[PDB]
Structure formats: C-alpha cells, structure tokens
Design a protein around this nucleic acid. Sequence first.
RNA 1: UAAUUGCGAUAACGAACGAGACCUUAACCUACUAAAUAGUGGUGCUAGCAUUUGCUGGUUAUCCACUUCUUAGAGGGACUAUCGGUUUCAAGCCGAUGGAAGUUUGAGGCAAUAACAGGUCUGUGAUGCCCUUAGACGUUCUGGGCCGCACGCGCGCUACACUGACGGAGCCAGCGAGUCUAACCUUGGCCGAGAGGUCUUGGUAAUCUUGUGAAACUCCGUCGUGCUGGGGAUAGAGCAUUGUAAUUAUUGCUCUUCAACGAGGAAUUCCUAGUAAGCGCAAGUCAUCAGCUUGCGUUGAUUACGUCCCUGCCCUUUGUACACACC
Lengths: 67, 69, 145, 143, 63, 142, 60, 206, 80
Amino acid sequence: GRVRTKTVKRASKALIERYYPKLTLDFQTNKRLCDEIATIQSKRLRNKIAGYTTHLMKRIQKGPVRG
Amino acid sequence: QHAVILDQEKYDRILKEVPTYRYVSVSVLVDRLKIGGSLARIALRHLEKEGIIKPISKHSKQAIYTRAT
Amino acid sequence: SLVVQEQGSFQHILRLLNTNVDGNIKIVYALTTIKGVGRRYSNLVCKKADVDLHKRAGELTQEELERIVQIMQNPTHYKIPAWFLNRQNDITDGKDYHTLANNVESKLRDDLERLKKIRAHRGIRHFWGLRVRGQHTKTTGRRRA
Amino acid sequence: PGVSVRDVAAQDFINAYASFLQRQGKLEVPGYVDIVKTSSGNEMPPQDAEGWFYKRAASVARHIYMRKQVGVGKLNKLYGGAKSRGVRPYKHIDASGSINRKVLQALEKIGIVEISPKGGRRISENGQRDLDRIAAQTLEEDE
Amino acid sequence: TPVTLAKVIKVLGRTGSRGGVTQVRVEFLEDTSRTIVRNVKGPVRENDILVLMESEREARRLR
Amino acid sequence: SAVPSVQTFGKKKSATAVAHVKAGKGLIKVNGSPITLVEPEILRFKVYEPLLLVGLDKFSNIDIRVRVTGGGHVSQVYAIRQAIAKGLVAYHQKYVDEQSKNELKKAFTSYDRTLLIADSRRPEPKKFGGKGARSRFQKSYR
Amino acid sequence: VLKISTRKTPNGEGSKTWETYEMRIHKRYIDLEAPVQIVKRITQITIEPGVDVEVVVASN
Amino acid sequence: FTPVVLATPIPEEVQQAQTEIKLFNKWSFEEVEVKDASLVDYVQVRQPIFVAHTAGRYANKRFRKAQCPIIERLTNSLMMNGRNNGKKLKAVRIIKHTLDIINVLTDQNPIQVVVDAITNTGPREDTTRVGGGGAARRQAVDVSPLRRVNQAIALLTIGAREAAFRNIKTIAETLAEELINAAKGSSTSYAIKKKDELERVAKSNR
Amino acid sequence: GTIVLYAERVQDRGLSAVAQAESMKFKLLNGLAIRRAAYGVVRYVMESGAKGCEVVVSGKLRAARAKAMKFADGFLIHSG
RNA sequence: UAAUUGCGAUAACGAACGAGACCUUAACCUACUAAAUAGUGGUGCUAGCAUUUGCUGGUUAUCCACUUCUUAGAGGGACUAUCGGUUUCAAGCCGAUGGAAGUUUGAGGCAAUAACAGGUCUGUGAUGCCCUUAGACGUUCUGGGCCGCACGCGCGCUACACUGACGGAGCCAGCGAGUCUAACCUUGGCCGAGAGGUCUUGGUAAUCUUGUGAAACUCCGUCGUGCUGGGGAUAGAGCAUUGUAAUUAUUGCUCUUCAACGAGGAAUUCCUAGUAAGCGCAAGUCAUCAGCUUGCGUUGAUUACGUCCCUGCCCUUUGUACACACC
Ligand SMILES: [Mg+2]
Ligand SMILES: [Mg+2]
Ligand SMILES: [Mg+2]
Ligand SMILES: [Mg+2]
Ligand SMILES: [Mg+2]
Ligand SMILES: [Mg+2]
Ligand SMILES: [Mg+2]
Ligand SMILES: [Mg+2]
Ligand SMILES: [Mg+2]
Ligand SMILES: [Mg+2]
Ligand SMILES: [Mg+2]
Ligand SMILES: [Mg+2]
Ligand SMILES: [Mg+2]
Ligand SMILES: [Mg+2]
Ligand SMILES: [Mg+2]
Ligand SMILES: [Mg+2]
Ligand SMILES: [Mg+2]
Ligand SMILES: [Mg+2]
Ligand SMILES: [Mg+2]
Ligand SMILES: [Mg+2]
C-alpha cells in the first residue's frame, strides 16, 4: 500500500508552515516551488513531498489540520 | 471393425441416406455407417460432385456440410 | 474421387515372407508387419514396384505382390542405395545385405554368438544380460526381465 | 492492372507454379527424389512422391524473388525443422543441402535465377517476368 | 418451482474459517418490502442479483 | 515535389510497425503486400478493424505503407493495426481539421482494442531458483 | 553489457543463490576533416584516464 | 451499403458485412438477449467484435473479467491441459467451427445458443466445506452471479474436453454436442448433469 | 620508456581504509593490544574529519574458541 | 501499512541504524543535440507485371533532405493526479475519469543488531597445530577407477495421442558470443541422402556471421481409434566428426529391432499478469559431449483481489524448577 514516510511528511509540515502564502492547491506549481525554497536530492522524493504538501493544502483549505 | 472399401451395397447406403442428415462431417459418416475415415474424407469430396450436400466451411481440421439444397 | 467398388477381387489377409499381412491396412504400413520392413523401407520398395500407395494391401494384384517381394530381397538391384539397408558390409562375406522374416532374428543370434564366442567385453554383457552400451546400471532398468 | 507475386496468397501462388513447372516438363528432378527425406530432422519422406520437388522449387523461386540474394545455407535453415530426439528435447535442424542446391542449379538451367554478387542466388529478369505472369494467372482464377 | 429473485444491497463481510463464504444483504427484487442476510460461494459485489432456492432460512456466522 | 505524407508507428511487445500515410488512390499495404492477404489468418479482421470502424471511404484519399519487425506472428498484427489507426488520425491531425479528427479518434477509443494507445505489458525477468519469473523449482524437504 | 554470472558461494552449500556482474562498455566516434597542426593537437589535447582514444587515417 | 473502391481491392463480403452491421465472424450481436436476468451484466454480449481474441487485459482488478465477451471467455477456457496452453489461435478456430456446427444443428443464433447454455448451467446454490466437527458436515449456500458464469464455462469446456478425448469427434463437434444439450438442458450434458447434482447436494445438507 | 612509474603522497591517510587497514595490521604485528589498536585507528579516522569509522577484528582474540569484536565511533550507513 | 509504515494515544521530548530514500533494469517522449557501423522520403542508373500516371523490386555511398521507426547523451514524466464513496470523516483503503505508467508502476541490486561449533583448509603462494617429506601422502609417466548393479530415495526428460502424429507449405524473435603473434564466429561456391567434406570469404565486430528465416505456431494434405503411422526404450549392422587415444558403445548420421507406457495409490511441489503453463534460443561448461544451469524472447490463459482452517513466522499476554536455555 501507499503510506508516505516520515522524511516525506516531516518535510510537508515544515514547508507548509513557513510558506503557506507561496503554496497553492496545485501539484505542478508547488512541485516547482520546491526547487526554489528547498534542496531535494532526487526528483521522485521532491515530487512525493510536493504531492503530500499539496494534499494537506487541499484539506487545510477546508478546515484546520491537527498538527 | 469398420469398412475401408466400398461394397456397392455400402455405396448404395450413402447417397440413399446422407441427404437425411442436415449435418454431416468426417465423424458423422463414421458412426452412422462404418466408414473408414480415410474413405469418409474421399466420400465427402465425392458428395460435393453435383452438390448432394452443400458446404459452408471447408478446413484442414474440420469439414461442415449441410442438407442438399 | 477414389470412390470405386471392387467385387470379389478384394481379399483381406494375405501371406508374405512367412508372415501374415492385414489387407484392410495401408500397403506402406501393411507390409511393415514383417521383421525387417519399417516405414522408410516399405515406402521405397513400393515405389520401385509401381504400386499405387493410395491402396490397401487387400487390393494389390498377386502380380503387384511378387513385384514387391522381389524388390525386397534384391533391393540393391532396383536402385535402392546400400545405406538404406540394415546390414551393409558383412563380417564374414563382405556383401551388402538386407535381411527379413525369421531371418533377421537368425542373424541377430549369429552376431551375438559371434562376439560371445570371441569372449569380448560387449559379448559378455549380452550373455549375462546387462546393458551393453555404456549406460549406468546403478539406478535404471529395474524390474528387469 | 499491374501484378506482382506479392499480391498472391503464398499457398495459392506456390501451388500453381509447382503444377506449371511439373507440366512444363522442363526442370531437372534429381536421380534420387523418391528416397530422400529433405532433412535429418524429418522422420519420413515427403508424401507427394511425384511433385514435392516441384513444390519446393516453386517455393524457392518466390522466396528469392522477394529478397535480394539467398544462399544454399539459408534454404536449409528456412526449410529447417524441429527434430525429435526421442527421449530428449527437440532442437532445430537444417535441411538436406543437395536438395536445395540441386534446385538452385536446376533453376538457372531455366534461368529463373542466377548466381549473384555478394553470393547466393538472385532472381533473373527472365524468372521475375515468369512468376509475375503466372502470378496474375492464379489471380484471375475468377472465371 | 417457487424460484425467487433477490438484489444485493450491502456486503457485510467474510465468514467461513477459510475465508471463502461472503455475507450479503439482499433486496427481494419482486417484493422490495423484504430484506434478508444470505451466504455466498462466489465473489459478490453490490447491486448484482442472487437466485434464492429456499426463501427463508437466513443464516449467520460460519466456519 | 515530395508529397504530403505523415508517419506513425505501432508497438506491441517487441514488435514495432512503421507506418507511412500520404494522399493517394487508396492502397493499404503491409510489408509490400495487400492487407487483404495478412494471413496469420483468423486474425485477419484484427487488421481490418481500423478500416471499418471509421468507414472504408476515409482511406480512398490515402496510401498506407506498413512494415513490421520483431515480436511474433500474433504480436505483429496488433502492432500494425495500431499503426494504421495511429496513422489515419495523424494525417487528419496535420492535414485536415480537428472536429473531423476526433470523429475518427473517438470512433476507435470507444471500441479501443489498443488501437491507438500502446499496451505496455512486457516480459518479466526470470529469477534464479526457477525456470519462470514466479515459477520455482520443485523442492522435496526430507 | 558484459555479463558474468556465478554462484555467491564457494564450495557448494546453501540455497542455490546466484550473482550477476556487469561491465558496461560505451563507444562513440566523431569524424573530422583537418590538416597538419589540428590533427596531432586534437588527439593529445583531448586526453583523459579511463577513456580509450583512437584516430583513423582513411580509405580502405 | 455504398460499395467504395480503393487501390488495393478489399472484397464485397468484407466491405458490406462490416461497415454496415458489426457481425461476429459473421453473426449479428443484436437481438441476442440474456434469457434469465440476474446473470446479465456478466454474460457480455453487447459490445460486438469480429474475432474472439483481443489484447485482453482483464486480470488486474476484480470484475474487469466481466467486460470480456462471453465468447472469448469461452474460447480462452478452451485452451487448457498442458499440451494446449497458450494456443489461443487454435481455440478460436475451434470456436468458429463450433458456432457453425450449432447454426446448422438448430438454425438460430449460435451466439444465443452459447449464452443460453452458460445460463442454465451455472449452479444457483452450492455446498461449502464447513468446520462441521471431525466428520465435517457441508453447509448449503447460494453462489454469486459471477461464479455462475465462471463455473458454467468451466464445466462446459471440460464437458467437450473430456468427451472428445479418445474419440473420433472433434472439439468443435463436442463443443456443440455440449452446448446444444445445455442451452436446452437435455441433461445429456456434462455440465448440466454436474449442475443438477451440485444443487441436489445443496437442497439437502442445509 | 613507454611506461613510466610516478609517485604520489596521499589524500590524508586517515580517510583511506586500506592505509588504515594496513595500520591495524602493522600495529597488531608490532605486538600492540587488541582493543588499543582498534580505538587508536578509530580515533585517527574520526580526527581526520570523517563521519564515522568501524573496525571489526575476527579470529582468535583470547585464543581457543574464535570470537569477533566491533569498535565503532560516529556515523555509518550500510544500505543502498 | 509490504514495513517500528504512519495517524494518533501519550511521562515523555528529540533523534541515529535497519524499512523508505538510493541504484539498476523495463515501459512514455513527432521536445533538444546527432548519425555510411542505425533508418526513412526523394532523386539518378537499372528489372518485371501493367501500360491510364501506376504496383513491386535491384544499386554500400549516383546525388540531395530528414531523425518518425533504431541507438544513447541531456532533460521532461507520477505525486497514487482528479472527482467520488468510506474512515477518529486522521493515516489510509475502495471506486470511477484521464494518464505511457496508478499491485512499493513492474523486476531486481543493496540491506541493521545479534546469533549458529550451518558449509567450505578440495578456490587461493590465505592460515594454527598435528601428520608425512626420496619403499614420499611431493611430482611426473603408463594403464584402470569415479559410470561398477538384486534394490531404497530425490531432481528431471520423453510420453500415453485426433486441442494429435506425419508430409508439404506459410514464416516471426530477444538476450547474447566471436581469430594475434592466432586458427574463434563463419556467409557464399562446389561435393555428399545424411552426418559431414572441400575451395574461398567477411568480421577484434550496431559494419562479417545475423533479419541468428528459432520452436511452439499458421495453412493444406495423409493417417482414423486399433498398445495405431501414439510412444521410442532395448538391440543389430554401417557411415562420419572431436581427440594422442572412443573398447566399458564421447557425439552425429542411416537402415533395421518397436519394449514399458491406456492419466498415474498414499502422499505432494510450484504459482496471481504478459503471470502460470507451453515453446525454443543464446550464454556458462566445452577438444568433443545438456536430458543441467544463468538469462532471453515467442504463444498466452483459468482462478484470487481473500482468510487464519493446516503450516511456518512475528509482536503482545501468560507459565517456568530452562540460561550449555525443551537435542
Ligand atoms: Mg516391421
Ligand atoms: Mg522455421
Ligand atoms: Mg516447416
Ligand atoms: Mg521425442
Ligand atoms: Mg523444454
Ligand atoms: Mg537508511
Ligand atoms: Mg532499500
Ligand atoms: Mg522506525
Ligand atoms: Mg545511410
Ligand atoms: Mg534511397
Ligand atoms: Mg482507463
Ligand atoms: Mg572439489
Ligand atoms: Mg560422480
Ligand atoms: Mg532442487
Ligand atoms: Mg513418431
Ligand atoms: Mg506440421
Ligand atoms: Mg507402433
Ligand atoms: Mg552441472
Ligand atoms: Mg513475564
Ligand atoms: Mg520470566
């Protein structure tokens, strides 16, 4: 199954907190934003982050998310 | 034991019967008569002389013939 | 269309080379009942005897019979090549042969007796009853006899 | 209006030319041909003792006609078969080379083919013309 | 023969200690005023239709 | 001169069927030979299926060259049927107008037997311990 | 792709495990048309360990 | 049908009996209705197809299997017992032959003949091996509509398979001698004998 | 003449396993103590700016039944 | 959740190793850079059927243009996207839409701590100790042995046939390998039923072998259920190849002999998609010899999309008189 790891989610929270205005609900733009404000050592990882970060946004923007 | 040579008597059986069957093939001949199977195959070339039977699919493996016309 | 009849002419079961030969089975294969005629030999003899292979040995004129029997015991004389044969270059006579009938078992016996008389390795096993070509005997050919 | 053999069914074409070749009387069926197996791989000799040689000749014609040049080797492997080895597993085994050669020698005797540069046989303009002709014949087998 | 059609409404889960028989709830098709739980041999999803022989019974857990 | 042609291809396993489509009197040829002859046999209508789903007439104004490599007697068929199909639409992409194209495009995908999207299944590598990629040599224990 | 496939084990005990090594050999060529000074310079100015180099005259 | 010409021929039996209706090998898919409901949605006879062979990709999800034409599921379930595996080409011909035998034997649509066969053969209720206790009894349950289609073909193909073994008859023939004796359950059918006995066992041990 | 041997020093021997490996060899060969030889190597690598170091001696340490000892300090990975 | 994978619950807070990341390989790219050792369109020169222009070939460069197909560099690409159903409406699971791809995308490489008297001194000029060291346990030479056959056991191969065999005929792969102070891959020509022989040839190789024209398979025909032309054991006779040397048959060929085997008791192995199964092929070995293995691709499914009933394991609860740890 598809469970995102700590290093992933750990990054998403970290990104979101200090970049909420800069980020959107769209995967591809966010994906790009990662190349600027973060230095990720591989593409799959970077997308995976960009993907979960975009996931939280799409529910953050529907009510405050626990952490 | 079957029959691998025409008996004339056996021959009469054929054309005075095969148009009974609305389905005839290699086997169809064998069990209703006691044809060889080898000769069954020649009897079927033969039985498409002046179409005593009519074809719908002729194949190496399987032959499908129907009643007269 | 091989749809023809034949009256009393057809005669099932005839006799060749001291063998009894089925008539309602194909010539090429009817003849292969004899100790010494396999498919490839029976296919060729027949060719050289002007015989219509599209036939059963229950046909075949008693004329067509001798014409076949003749070629079978003098094959090398009817444009049959020596390699096609089951005993070329004898060990006592040097002539190219092709044995048949009860006569094959005979020269099978002679051959064995031969190199048994001589008490060579190969001959011994035959007598004992072991396998004579270099196979293992440890784990195979069991139940014997 | 403008036929190649390439517009012909293979079993259609090659059946016809084998009959035309046989009828033509001119070829050269080798002295054996009644005793031969065509490959060590095979079990028995060809069942149409009469015209199998005609059958193969036909095939080879059309086969070199579609290529550039094909040799005696290739023809062994093209006509190669699977050999039973009894209690052992089957492998691919080439054909008799006399057969496919004697064809390729008795096919310049009627100039359908010829020797080629690079090696092997090519199709002659004599032959190329010959097949496309009897291609169209079995084409218009429609009355 | 009193054969009865029935439409699946909900897949409860899988009993049988093997895990071969699946529980289901059916909408009696002809008379929708009935709703019962049955056991199935094959793979069943929602909405497909079952053909009930003895139209009472109604079983539960299995091994 | 050089003719208005277009070029597409079809793949199915290791098969790769090159296609050439130019305006023409309606030839449709695979490996220098009429499509009506593609005799891996019972699958004949597997190569026909791009021609009759969209209308035989769309092809009267186009000459098709197909030729195949790789795969087998059966993988090739699927690879050429997909070449023709990907070709009719590509000609119509470059040379005609859109609204027409997605009559053709929508015709196929509603029926799609791969037709214009390449089946991506490939063989799986064998692993040591068995003749197959999942098949394991028989063991025996005690 | 060079391929060497053997057993991980020495002797012959344990599950019948195998290993497979590779050596990857990469090749390419570039064609030039240049005379006296540009020929002997370019063979040597472009040089680097691990990289095999070779230049060819012409014709046959 | 407005016969269009082009450079390379393309026959009239092609041109017409295609672009008009999508007949099978050349049988019409229309008007074939699944007699007996409940088994519908599973006996797929509604997306027409010329041949019984597709780049089938039906075993990733669970019931994608059901969007496979019941003809092809039949022609697939043919090709088995080691010496037959993979040989789908052969099976397809065996089928083409089967339908032709059937249409000769009883007019009608042989594709409707095949369907009718599948339906009346699939067991409505079955027996599962319950815990029971030592001499473990056998519980009686009904069976899914998906297995009814599955088991049908199975029995049926094994019907023709086992029949035509050491017998002169061809598979194409016994496939028809097993479908016709089942599309109107004569009980001279392996499947139909098998089905009535599953239920005999099911009406019982409940 | 067509072949010519050259000579380098090193890029800090504390970072090369081989130069270290042989150091444990010589140190042990020069009679040194098992555990001391271990840590002294470890601490040279570690003070050579490494991220970690692990030295594993197997064999007969205190004779008879053979054992193995692991002396590590810092950080290692093992995986991909 | 495949996962100490995560949400969370929280006297814990924050982290490292392992898992994941990572790497390889396989899928998409009409976007970039290129190509006589890869292809294609046109153009010359030339062949044939048609001749209504056309269809089909030949030409290692005739000459030009290109990069779709091929190759491999550089990047792009997916994140389980989008919507929907569930759920602490959390991690997530399911569905439908598109997408080359939505089972960790498929498949591997790597892989912590701790442990076993598990195997290997017969891989090593790795090695302690014992042993032996010129009637040698060293070394080399001649011959035999490892294969010896009442029988037990395991891995296989070929089969019992008609969804077949045999004969024609159609004809399609991918992974691979190959000769310097040398005799490897070998086309082609001739000869030979065959096996093989002989004269030449190309290639240190995307260039020559080789489109490795592979088998399964497809068509047509013969056979017609009979231990049959299914099956090919055992055996006789002969011809060739490797090698100093083939006997205790190295292998290959040809004719002949034509066994058991009519679906396999109790048991029992392996498998979830290009998979199982069937099919052959290259590579290792190799002078010769594969019924073995390592990979490769061709044909291509039924059944599951589950559970703890059996059998192993893993965590937790629990008992202990075990700790050399239920041998
Ligand atoms: Mg005999
Ligand atoms: Mg072949
Ligand atoms: Mg063949
Ligand atoms: Mg065999
Ligand atoms: Mg095999
Ligand atoms: Mg890690
Ligand atoms: Mg890992
Ligand atoms: Mg953890
Ligand atoms: Mg070029
Ligand atoms: Mg050109
Ligand atoms: Mg979709
Ligand atoms: Mg050893
Ligand atoms: Mg041994
Ligand atoms: Mg084993
Ligand atoms: Mg045989
Ligand atoms: Mg055949
Ligand atoms: Mg026999
Ligand atoms: Mg071995
Ligand atoms: Mg406790
Ligand atoms: Mg305790």
